[PDB]
Structures are given as structure tokens and as C-alpha cells.
Amino acid sequence: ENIVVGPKPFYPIEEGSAGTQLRKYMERYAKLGAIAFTNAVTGVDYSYAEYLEKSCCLGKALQNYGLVVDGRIALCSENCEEFFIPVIAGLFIGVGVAPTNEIYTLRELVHSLGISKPTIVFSSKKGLDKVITVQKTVTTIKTIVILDSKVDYRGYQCLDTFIKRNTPPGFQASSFKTVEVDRKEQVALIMNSSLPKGVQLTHENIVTRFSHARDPIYGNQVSPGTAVLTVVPFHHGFGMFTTLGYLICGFRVVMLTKFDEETFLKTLQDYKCTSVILVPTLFAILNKSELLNKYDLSNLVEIASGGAPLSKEVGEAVARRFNLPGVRQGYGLTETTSAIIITPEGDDKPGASGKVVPLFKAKVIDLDTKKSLGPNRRGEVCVKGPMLMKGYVNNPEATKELIDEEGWLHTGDIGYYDEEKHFFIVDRLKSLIKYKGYQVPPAELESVLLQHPSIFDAGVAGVPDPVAGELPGAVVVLESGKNMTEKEVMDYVASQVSNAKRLRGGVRFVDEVPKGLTGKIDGRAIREILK
């Protein structure tokens, strides 16, 4: 009808499980002498050969430990260079992996691990306290392994100890064989979005991502040794599936845990990074930065973003500062594995999230009538393709509400496409501010607020009102030293937008705009601050 269809992929989906394909590629970069992971802050490298060997050795160890196909393990860790060893090993042996982050509240962690039910938890040092407390409630956790220590830590086996205690002394990594699985049925990963539900992704979902990752238009060209800088969380699909695609491509993954303006720029220079992937929050910092010029950034050819709405004006300004044509955006959901809309190489358009990825379909549906829309009409984005999740763990009800009777997943996101089939993502449906008969997107007002020289960060939500239903209000973080009044912010917004978008609900100044880990505004937190 009004359906938008993505092209055929350059590279067909290869045969084999997610683990078989990963080993195939990693083996190649291993012989080359390539480095897989670099911690930018400590300067610690892991070559592809060491990473491959530790993943194979861990795979054997887990089998010897007694884990069968369709068993479960989890991670609870902030970004560290060892993060993917349990992930890759799990994929090699057909055991489901549930990534969580150290930054979870205990309530989130008890609920998340309560759903996935892991036999072993690979924890970082910093996460150990929280994982010990989770174990008192989620009592099916037998073992905790410390991921980022070379020696045992507080009485818990470190990763090397567990491999050593669970492989024979004569075992060579090279004698290990990956397990073939039923691809469309085998759960590979249990993901949480940014109380969490368990999103089940299969080996088929993942091997499709691998095809996109190496696509010359929708991914990155294979080029071993090329350094990429990432600041995105690894436990989330944003970080999970960009990173796995980088390993397929042979890239050197430069990881930066805590963001810092000077460290960020030093890193880009010192590793001659070709590309950088960011959450939208960080653009605000780069647009204001006075330091850009004191660094050699001549090698940077691509700046990528995702996770949350990106101000088209801030994005353009940042592209201009780094002398690039545009920003490469990706858009997707945890439920669709990874990005299903991606900026095509050499087809940038300011404010667009990109175009439908190979093997996917997209449509925009009217909010009222559920009917398909032509270009330039806003509505709910729906998508269909082989990266749709298997379902939520033990939640058939929520699964049915998301994927309709015709196999279309309803994103809960509002957007539109233009005459050229470029997709623009506006905001989340649940976030629209219902001011009288208007539906006002907070992202549109956030953008205006971000263009202000005195405003570092902003967030917008609706405030209840007996007359109008909802009034747009904002929380605003000023640049250090700078100073503004509630009315100054309101007057500046009023001069730029139409009547309906005015900040009738007030402005409050805060230290930190409440946000999720991938950049999405916590509208509930802002409502409360404002009221």
C-alpha cells in the first residue's frame, strides 16, 4: 500500500549460528595481529587472538561446569574491555546471555535477573555488592565470577580462575568447536530496554545484524585495524549490536567509560579514530567546546548518533565544527534487535534518522484510524522484518500488544517519511503533551532550549492543568557561571515557537536533567520536579 520496503542486502545472510559466524571473522583478525578492544583511559589492549582464545576457553569451561544448550548466564557490569568474553562464549555454546549494567538500582536488578534466571553471574568489581544482594532474593544464582580482575577478589573466582578450575590442564583453545543451533528458535540474548521486561533475541536476529554491519551503504566497510570510539553502554542493544558488528568488521574498539571533554578529544587524536558513536546528550558538550582546535582530529570521518531524539540544529552545527557532511543516525528499539532505520552512506539529510534497512518494511499509521499514511504525515511507526524479537520472557500478553495480528511491531514512536523515503523520528507517543487539542512533542521544545548559549541541557514534560489538560514545562541546566531567570527562558522560547508550544507550565533549574542511559528523558521524574 503505503509500505516502505528496504533493499536487498549487499552481503547475504551467511550460514551458521551467531557464534559460528563470529569465530569465522575473529579467527581472521587474530592471525593478522589486530587489536579488538582498547580501554582509552588505561590504554590496555586486547588483541583479537587473546579475545578469541579467552572466549573459546570460557565456552569449554561453561560446558564442563554443566551448562547445556538453552542454559542462562548473566553479566552485571559497567563498560569494561572484558565485557564481551561471556557474551561471545555464550553465543559459541548456545547458552542465553542476559546483560545488565552496574548502574541499575537494586530493584531493577532483582527484577531483571528474576526474569532471566541465570545460573552464573559475571560481575565487575564495582557491581559485586549489588549482585551479592540480588543473590539473597534470586536464589537460583549458583556462582558469581569477577570479570575485570586478574586475581581472585574478596573470595570470588576471577575469570581466569574459573577457566582454570573448569578446564583440563592439557586443553588447547584450538580444539574447541561451536555448537550449531536452531537459528530462528534459539534465544541468544535477553535484553532490557532503557520494571524491565526480558526481550528475547535469537541467533537469526543477530546474524541479520551482521549482514547490516558490513553493508557498504547501511553499515561500515570491512577495514581491520581501523579505530572506532564508543561511549555507548554495552549491556543495552545500542552498545551490544554496534560492538558485535565492529568485531565482524575487524575494527579496533576504543572504549571510553566515563566521559570527559579533554579525555574524549585526546582519545580521538591518540588513537586516530575514524569514527565515533555517541548518545545525543554529548553533542551539547561538543557544540560548546573551546578545545576542538588544540587537537588533531583530521582522521575522524564519521560521527554517529542514536538512542534518543537529536536536535537537527545541534547535529548540523556539530557536523560543521568537525568538517563533516552530516551526522550518521540509527533508529531502533530493543525489540527490533538493533537499528532498522539507518543513514545511508553519502545520503545524509539534516534531522533524518535515515532509511529502512535491508530486509525490513516500515509504515506510518494514523493515530485515530489505524490507516497507512503517505509522505509528510505524522503517525505511529510500525516495522516488520527478521530482527523482530521472539517475544518477552513469560509475558505473552505484552508480546501480543506490541506485535499485531499481521506481524507488524508497533514502536510507540511518532514519525514521518518524506517524498524521498527518508524517515524522521519525532518523539515517543506516550510523551506528547496534550495541550487542549494539540499534541506537542517535548523533543521539539528541547531543541529550541538547546540552541541557547546559556543552556547546557534541558528536558520537557507536561504538567497537569484543569483548564488545558496539560501544559509544557521544562527543567533546565545552565552552563557553569551563566545565569538566567524562569521568565528569561520563557520569553526566549515564546519568541521562537508558535503559541501552543509556549512553556506555560513553568521552568525549573536543576543540576541534572533526569535521563535514561541511552539519552531518553524521564518524563515522570520531570513532572514531579515541576509539580
In the complex, minimum distance from the CB of residue 453 to ligand AMP, in angstroms, rounded to a whole number: 25
Mention every residue, 6+ apart, whose C-beta is less than 8 A from residue 116: 72, 74, 96, 98, 190, 198, 393
Q: Are 284 and 456 in contact (CB under 8 A)?
A: yes
The residue among 112 and 329 lying less far from ligand AMP, judged by its C-beta, is 329
The residue among 60 and 428 lying less far from ligand AMP, judged by its C-beta, is 428
Q: Which among 307, 111, 106 has a CA at the least distance from the CA of 190?
A: 111
Catalytic hit among 355, 452, 501, 520: 520
* Catalytic status, residue 258: no
The residue among 193 and 269 lying less far from ligand AMP, judged by its C-beta, is 193
Mention every residue, 6+ apart, whose C-beta is less than 8 A from residue 265: 289, 291, 292, 294, 295, 297
In the complex, minimum distance from the CB of residue 20 to ligand AMP, in angstroms, rounded to a whole number: 27
Do the bridges between strand 4-5 and strand 423-428 make them parallel or antiparallel, or are there none, so unpaired? Answer: unpaired
Catalytic hit among 125, 130, 236, 452: 236
In the complex, minimum distance from the CB of residue 425 to ligand AMP, in angstroms, rounded to a whole number: 4
The residue among 101 and 329 lying less far from ligand AMP, judged by its C-beta, is 329
* Catalytic status, residue 410: no
Catalytic hit among 23, 125, 209, 452: 209
511, 512, 514, 518 alpha-carbon torsion, rounded to 10°: 180
Chain centroid to CA 292: how far?
26
* Catalytic status, residue 105: no
Catalytic hit among 378, 390, 421, 434: 434
In the complex, the residues that contact ligand AMP under the rule CB under 6 A are 193-194, 306-309, 329, 331, 333-334, 353, 411, 413, 425, 428, 518, 520
Helices of type H across 250-346: 261-270, 281-288, 312-321
The residue among 242 and 329 lying less far from ligand AMP, judged by its C-beta, is 329
In the complex, minimum distance from the CB of residue 520 to ligand AMP, in angstroms, rounded to a whole number: 6
Separation between Cα atoms, residue 190 and residue 64, nearest integer Å: 23
In the complex, minimum distance from the CB of residue 443 to ligand AMP, in angstroms, rounded to a whole number: 8
The residue among 227 and 443 lying less far from ligand AMP, judged by its C-beta, is 443
First to last CA, the chain: 45
In the complex, minimum distance from the CB of residue 350 to ligand AMP, in angstroms, rounded to a whole number: 14
* Catalytic status, residue 434: yes
Grid look-up 503517505 returns 374
* Catalytic status, residue 236: yes
SS3 475: strand
The catalytic residues are 209, 236, 334, 434, 520
